[PDB]
């Protein structure tokens, strides 16, 4: 019967592996996106001593800026967006205020309600755009960016990959955004097409089904959420 790939990046995979434990289907783990580090200067390093505020987006803004500012975080006052953030600052040694969770809640916060001529950098990966940063912008405040990871697919072997795949019997492929799409449909081969034009494609939204089926894909359904019930529900379980 049906033989799953799983493509979530490194981590996020080990739920719906479980599921498919209990239910006896045979899968593969390749995670088709990522997140990298980014490059960083000494420019950029030296400019952080004079940053008045610090602000956190992700949890992978603080892990790939622990690398470049482990013992030598900037003496400023610093701020998180979500719960995970927060937490990955607390172990650092760092107390950050909360989005009190997304990040234009941080507009609301009276700290940051007076902050002309402040200079703020906000920790992110790269790309983008940061609408709460440009109300900080309006606000008067000199902000930077410090673009610490970037999304990317990991580094594979795409032959050896799509041949591991077919061998392995992979016929249905879970993929859980247009970025995941993407990569998955640059990643095979031209010649392979055909192949993953035959596999069942498992995607979170309406939209990106038009984004498959516009790339000549045939065999598409919409789970119309990327979560594990609605993708379990789409696979009929």
Not at 10 to 38: H, R, T
Not at 162 to 190: A, C, H, M, Y
């Amino acid at each position: 019967g049906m033989k799953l790939l799983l493509t979530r990046p490194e981590g996020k995979n080990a739920a719906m592996a479980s599921a498919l434990d209990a239910l006896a289907i045979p899968y593969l783990v390749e995670p088709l996106l990522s997140v990298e580090a980014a490059a960083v200067t000494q420019a950029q390093l030296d400019e952080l001593s004079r940053a008045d505020i610090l602000i956190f987006i992700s949890t992978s803004a603080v892990s790939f800026a622990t690398p470049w500012l482990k013992d030598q975080w900037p003496k400023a006052t610093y701020y998180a967006v979500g719960d995970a953030t927060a937490d990955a600052l607390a172990l650092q040694g760092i107390t950050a205020e909360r989005s009190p969770q997304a990040t234009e809640g941080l507009l609301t916060l009276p700290s940051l309600e007076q902050v002309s001529g402040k200079q703020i950098v906000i920790v992110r990966g790269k790309g983008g755009r940061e609408a709460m940063a440009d109300g900080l912008r309006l606000r008067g405040a000199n902000v930077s960016y410090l673009e610490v990871y970037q999304r990317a697919c990991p580094p594979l072997d795409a032959p050896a990959s799509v041949s591991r795949w077919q061998s392995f019997g992979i016929d249905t492929i879970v993929v859980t955004s247009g970025e995941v799409l993407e990569n998955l449909i640059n990643l095979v081969p031209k010649d392979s097409f055909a192949w993953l034009r035959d596999c069942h494609i498992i995607v979170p939204s309406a939209r990106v089904e038009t984004q498959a089926r516009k790339k000549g894909l045939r065999r598409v359904t919409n789970a119309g959420a990327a979560n594990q019930a609605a993708v379990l529900d789409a696979l009929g379980m």
